[PDB]
Structures are given as structure tokens and as C-alpha cells.
Write an enzyme that holds these catalytic residues in place. Structure first.
Site, PDB file in Angstrom:
ATOM      1  N   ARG A  45       0.454  -1.014   0.068  1.00 58.72           N
ATOM      2  CA  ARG A  45       0.024  -0.132  -0.310  1.00 58.72           C
ATOM      3  C   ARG A  45       0.777   0.966   0.105  1.00 58.72           C
ATOM      4  O   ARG A  45       0.288   2.607  -0.270  1.00 58.72           O
ATOM      5  CB  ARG A  45      -0.811  -0.172   1.521  1.00 58.72           C
ATOM      6  CG  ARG A  45      -0.106   0.244   2.884  1.00 58.72           C
ATOM      7  CD  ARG A  45      -1.404   0.285   3.867  1.00 58.72           C
ATOM      8  NE  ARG A  45      -0.434   0.217   5.059  1.00 58.72           N
ATOM      9  CZ  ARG A  45       0.065  -0.658   5.491  1.00 58.72           C
ATOM     10  NH1 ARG A  45      -0.382  -2.935   5.307  1.00 58.72           N
ATOM     11  NH2 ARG A  45       0.357  -1.384   6.627  1.00 58.72           N
ATOM     12  N   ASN A  46       2.367   1.663   0.593  1.00 59.33           N
ATOM     13  CA  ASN A  46       3.385   1.927   0.487  1.00 59.33           C
ATOM     14  C   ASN A  46       4.247   2.502  -0.520  1.00 59.33           C
ATOM     15  O   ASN A  46       4.767   3.261  -0.517  1.00 59.33           O
ATOM     16  CB  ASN A  46       3.730   2.287   2.064  1.00 59.33           C
ATOM     17  CG  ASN A  46       2.642   2.831   3.085  1.00 59.33           C
ATOM     18  OD1 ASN A  46       1.597   3.759   2.747  1.00 59.33           O
ATOM     19  ND2 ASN A  46       2.833   2.166   3.880  1.00 59.33           N
ATOM     20  N   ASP A  69       5.247   7.178   2.292  1.00 62.86           N
ATOM     21  CA  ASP A  69       4.603   7.093   3.677  1.00 62.86           C
ATOM     22  C   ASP A  69       5.379   7.271   4.214  1.00 62.86           C
ATOM     23  O   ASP A  69       6.103   6.076   4.781  1.00 62.86           O
ATOM     24  CB  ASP A  69       3.427   6.869   3.306  1.00 62.86           C
ATOM     25  CG  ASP A  69       2.975   6.842   5.013  1.00 62.86           C
ATOM     26  OD1 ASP A  69       2.920   7.687   5.528  1.00 62.86           O
ATOM     27  OD2 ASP A  69       1.843   5.160   5.195  1.00 62.86           O
TER      28      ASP A  69
HETATM   29  C1  63M Z   1      -0.476   8.552   3.056  1.00 63.43           C
HETATM   30  N1  63M Z   1      -0.279   7.123   1.443  1.00 63.43           N
HETATM   31  N2  63M Z   1      -0.029   6.274   1.544  1.00 63.43           N
HETATM   32  C2  63M Z   1       0.868   5.732   0.512  1.00 63.43           C
HETATM   33  C3  63M Z   1       0.920   6.927   0.011  1.00 63.43           C
HETATM   34  C4  63M Z   1       0.917   7.937   1.180  1.00 63.43           C
HETATM   35  S1  63M Z   1       1.182   9.840   1.065  1.00 63.43           S
HETATM   36  O1  63M Z   1       1.726  10.135   1.946  1.00 63.43           O
HETATM   37  O2  63M Z   1       0.216  10.321   0.748  1.00 63.43           O
HETATM   38  N3  63M Z   1       2.655   9.833  -0.225  1.00 63.43           N
HETATM   39  C5  63M Z   1       1.768  10.172  -1.242  1.00 63.43           C
HETATM   40  C6  63M Z   1       3.119  10.505  -2.414  1.00 63.43           C
HETATM   41  C7  63M Z   1       2.643  10.668  -3.703  1.00 63.43           C
HETATM   42  N4  63M Z   1       1.553  10.477  -4.442  1.00 63.43           N
HETATM   43  N5  63M Z   1       0.806  10.388  -6.027  1.00 63.43           N
HETATM   44  C8  63M Z   1      -0.669   9.889  -5.078  1.00 63.43           C
HETATM   45  C9  63M Z   1      -0.792   9.393  -4.058  1.00 63.43           C
HETATM   46  C10 63M Z   1      -1.653   9.047  -3.396  1.00 63.43           C
HETATM   47  O3  63M Z   1      -3.133   7.825  -4.494  1.00 63.43           O
HETATM   48  N6  63M Z   1      -1.936   8.458  -2.430  1.00 63.43           N
HETATM   49  C11 63M Z   1      -3.274   7.685  -1.848  1.00 63.43           C
HETATM   50  C12 63M Z   1      -4.245   8.908  -1.338  1.00 63.43           C
HETATM   51  C13 63M Z   1      -2.912   7.550   0.048  1.00 63.43           C
HETATM   52  C14 63M Z   1      -2.553   6.379  -1.894  1.00 63.43           C
HETATM   53  C15 63M Z   1       0.485  10.047  -3.330  1.00 63.43           C
HETATM   54  N7  63M Z   1       0.791   9.482  -1.905  1.00 63.43           N
END
Ligand code: 63M
Length: 314
Positions: free
Chosen positions: A146-147, A160
Site C-alpha cells: 500500500r506504501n 509514506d
Molecule cells: C498516506 N500514503 N499512503 C501511501 C502513500 C501515502 S502519501 O504519504 O500520501 N504519499 C504520496 C505521494 C505521492 N502520491 N501520488 C499519489 C498518491 C496517492 O494516491 N496517495 C493515496 C491517496 C494515499 C493512496 C501519493 N501519495
């Protein structure tokens, strides 16, 4: 003693970037798809804008700024880049957009088109990013499919860093992903690069099974005892004994016995040179996934001055 962290923290103006749509929302907060148009640079960088839900509290701002610190301190092709932060009332993390979402949803949604080449290439890529974090003395503490997000079907990056810690780490209570954690991490709250190897093992299992939930139906409180007895995750049907043996080695009691990420890169690379000898998939090599050499690959997300963050260096 420890080398000074000379990373630059870029503060971005709210007016410089535009929110397009919500990609997702939950415990992490709300992630938006956006475009960053810097100064008079004549560039449009696709970005992911993250903010914790909505409510502004000093506790929420600390956690998100700690995440900005960790992220600004990393530079690897297989680790998500933090472009900057926006100092609004809320406080936003501006990271590079991963247009195809997480790997877990990717493997689930595209199983009928995912071949062995892609699978072993993803494993190599994840190990490369994880080994980089190890070089930078960083323990992820939350590696899962998922990360691991998708830039292009052929290029994945580690994301993440909400749990990530700069160096064994001694944690406390809260919400822990037990089914991805090493035994020492569950029983003693001990986190090492070798506990990240256990999480890598489960991540590989997630990919090889095409998004199956590990220990499905078993309550998290039972996991600790199950691992203590000697029980592990089953051999996925597409896995040869060569690939499953690697996964099993990531799940040993003795952390020093588990593989190192630099060895995992090597092992998966050897296998990726001849994917059909290590993963048995029905229809493999006749399968198709989008690539930058496909019609309307980039148009599927205005353009002309669109540059990916990996090509926008400063
Ligand atoms: C919280 N989380 N889980 C997986 C990734 C993350 S994040 O920390 O928001 N990081 C990042 C970085 C770039 N991108 N580009 C697209 C996403 C994305 O679709 N994120 C969700 C909605 C959380 C699955 C993203 N997420």
C-alpha cells in the site's frame, strides 16, 4: 560524530500550485492531485498535496513537519521526492505525483496483465530504495504494498514516511501494522533495517499473490503466537521454490539470518534476467501494460510545459 543534514526545505507559495481532485482520504488525512507552476520557470510539475484531514492542531502540525524532515533528507530514484511544504493554516506536504496509485491496488486491478518481468523488476526496485534508506541510516517501520506507489507501471517508489525514524528503535503504543511486522517488533517494539526486511518479505508476498491480505481472517492478537510456533505465509501459486525461499529467509527469528537489502537487489536481479524460470504465470509475455511508448499515455492525466519532478532539478 554524525554528519550535518544539509538538506534544503523548500517553502512553496499556495498561489504557485493548483488542486485538481481528491485522490484519497483517511487516517493519514486527504491527498489531492495537483500541478505546481514555479516562479517564471515555464514548467507544470504534477504533484500530490497531502494535508491531515482538516482540523489544525499543534500535534498534527508536528507529525506532518517530521514527515517533511525525513522526506527532504532523501534522494533516490526509488523513493518518493518531497518538492516542498506550503505554510498555510493547515500545512501541506508537496510530493511528486505517483499517477497509477499504490501497488496493492495496481496488482489487484491489473492481475490479468502483470507478468513475471514486472513482478521481479518491482522487487529489485523496492530493495534498491530500501537499501538507500539503510545507507541513510533510516528505518521505514511501515513498508507494505500500500506504501509502494506507481510512477509508471515499470517504475515504483517507496512512499509514506509517517512512521520513518533516523537511527534499534524503541517505540510506544498506538496503531501498528502487526501482519507486516517482525516478531521482535511485535513483542519488544524493536525496529531495525532487518525488521524492514521482514516487511519487505510480506510486501513481496502481497505482489506474488496479486494483492491477497496476509493472514486473512486471523485477528492481529493471534499473529504473535502463530509466528512464535513457526507458521508463515503460504507459497503463492505463481512462486517457484527459489522465490519462496527468499521470502522465508526474510521471516526468520534471527534478524542477522534474514537477507540484507543489497543481497535482495542481487538475488531478484539474477531472477529478473530470466523471469519465466522463477515465476510461472499463465499467459506471461503476451501480457500488456501502458508504457511512455503508448498512445495517450501522458494525455490520460493542460500540457506542453509538463515536466515530471524527476526531471525538475534545483
Ligand atoms: C498516506 N500514503 N499512503 C501511501 C502513500 C501515502 S502519501 O504519504 O500520501 N504519499 C504520496 C505521494 C505521492 N502520491 N501520488 C499519489 C498518491 C496517492 O494516491 N496517495 C493515496 C491517496 C494515499 C493512496 C501519493 N501519495
Amino acid at each position: 560524530g554524525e554528519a550535518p543534514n544539509q538538506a534544503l526545505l523548500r517553502i512553496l507559495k499556495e498561489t504557485e500550485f493548483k488542486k485538481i481532485k481528491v485522490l484519497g482520504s483517511g487516517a493519514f488525512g486527504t491527498v489531492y492531485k495537483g500541478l505546481w507552476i514555479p516562479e517564471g520557470e515555464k514548467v507544470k510539475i504534477p504533484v500530490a498535496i497531502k494535508e491531515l484531514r482538516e482540523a489544525t492542531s499543534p500535534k498534527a502540525n508536528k507529525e506532518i513537519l517530521d514527515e517533511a524532515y525525513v522526506m527532504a533528507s532523501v534522494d533516490n530514484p526509488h523513493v518518493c521526492r518531497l518538492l516542498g511544504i506550503c505554510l498555510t493554516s493547515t500545512v501541506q506536504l508537496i510530493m511528486q505525483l505517483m499517477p497509477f496509485g499504490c501497488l496493492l491496488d495496481y496488482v489487484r486491478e491489473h492481475k490479468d496483465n502483470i507478468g513475471s518481468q514486472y513482478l521481479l523488476n518491482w522487487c529489485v526496485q523496492i530493495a534498491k530504495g530500501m537499501n538507500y534508506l539503510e545507507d541513510r541510516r533510516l528505518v521505514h517501520r511501515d513498508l507494505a504494498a500500500r506504501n509502494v506507489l506507481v510512477k509508471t507501471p515499470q517504475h515504483v517508489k517507496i512512499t509514506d514516511f509517517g512512521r520513518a525514524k533516523l537511527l534499534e528503535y524503541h517505540a510506544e503504543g498506538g496503531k501498528v501494522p502487526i501482519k507486516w511486522m517482525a516478531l521482535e517488533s511485535i513483542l519488544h517494539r524493536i525496529y531495525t533495517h532487518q525488521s524492514d526486511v521482514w516487511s519487505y518479505g510480506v510486501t513481496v508476498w502481497e505482489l506474488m499473490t496479486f494483492g491477497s491480505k496476509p493472514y486473512d481472517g486471523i485477528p492481529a492478537s493471534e499473529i504473535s503466537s502463530i509466528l512464535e510456533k513457526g507458521e508463515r505465509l503460504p507459497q503463492p501459486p505463481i512462486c517457484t521454490i527459489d522465490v519462496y525461499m527468499i521470502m522465508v529467509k526474510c521471516w526468520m527469528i534471527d534478524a542477522d539470518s534474514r537477507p540484507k537489502f543489497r543481497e535482495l537487489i542481487i538475488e531478484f536481479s539474477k531472477m529478473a534476467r530470466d523471469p519465466q524460470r522463477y515465476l510461472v504465470i499463465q499467459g506471461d509475455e503476451r501480457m500488456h501494460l501502458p508504457s511512455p511508448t503508448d498512445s495517450n499515455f501522458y494525455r490520460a492525466l493542460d500540457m506542453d510545459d509538463v515536466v515530471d519532478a524527476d526531471e525538475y532539478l534545483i
